[model samples]
Target: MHHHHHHGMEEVTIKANLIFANGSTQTAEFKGTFEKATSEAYAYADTLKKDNGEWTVDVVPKAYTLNIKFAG
Candidate 1:
């Protein structure tokens, strides 16, 4: 998922991970507003279901304040 800071920046880029049951992983980069980046992550995860496991979306900036999560 994603967290937003009031950085007043024009755009944000986020990294997403698609984790698989075999412990293999793939990643992609997304750029947009906070909501858009988060949406793209979930959408990308859906495409990874062929090799999916319990998935998680963790954002950077560690203590970013805004909390977004996917239980599946």
Candidate 2:
């Protein structure tokens, strides 16, 4: 029973690191297919945008950076 469909519905993870100009950082982690994970992570990142003046998100770092993971 435990071995049934062993290779099906495996886990996939995405971690998006949010680097900001104010010496701050954040992480957004999600699990799903690449298409869905990328969309969800990007959408969450979009909400952190800042363009008034002073310091905005450090675009250079995340310009962007992503960590992709797949589990067995």
Candidate 3:
């Protein structure tokens, strides 16, 4: 998941992130991608199946934004 703020500048970077499971957490950083792709205002619902489990999803739109939630 990502939240982007446009500053009219060309460079955007990740400042911080936390990875948590159940009740444990770890600080993390993401690397930059050099791939060329169109930049636009959009989002998507990801139904990813993994060893974890099946997930229920809810998506809501709010003021040019999308919110995706996973319900266990």
Candidate 4:
């Protein structure tokens, strides 16, 4: 599929960025490994904003941990 930024808000999940290599300023769309049902969104950034009639994405990586739960 062609990568194009939408004009409205998109819900993002499963976030991971291009790091630990020859890093470039780019965003990555995350996909699930264990399940077919998962979320996709723009990585390596926070919120998108419009500045001076131009669209910009805020690339602020916040450190956090992931938690997993299982049903017994």
Each prediction's TM-score versus the true structure: 0.61, 0.51, 0.26, 0.21
Off by over 4 Å in 3: 1-9, 31-72
Q: Residues 9-64, candidate 3: write the lDDT tens digits.
A: 23423323222235543433332421111111111112212422443422222234
- Candidate 4 clashing pairs, residues 3+ apart or interchain: none
Better of 1 and 3 by lDDT: 1
Measured by TM-score, how close is model 2 to the native structure? 0.51
lDDT of 2 by residue, 1-72 (tens): 222122345456777776676767778788775556667877776665554223223212122235688896
- Per-residue lDDT over 1-72 for candidate 1, one digit per residue giving the tens place of the 0 to 100 score: 453554555467777766677777787888887778779888888766665645666666532445589899
Better of 1 and 4 by TM-score: 1
Clashing pairs in 1: none
Model 3 TM-score is 0.26
Of candidates 2 and 1, the better by TM-score: 1
Clashes found in each candidate (C-alpha, N, C closer than 3 A): 0, 0, 0, 0
Poorest 10 consecutive residues by lDDT, candidate 1: 1-10
Deviation (Å) of 44 in candidate 1 = 0.9
lDDT accuracy of residue 22 in candidate 4: 38
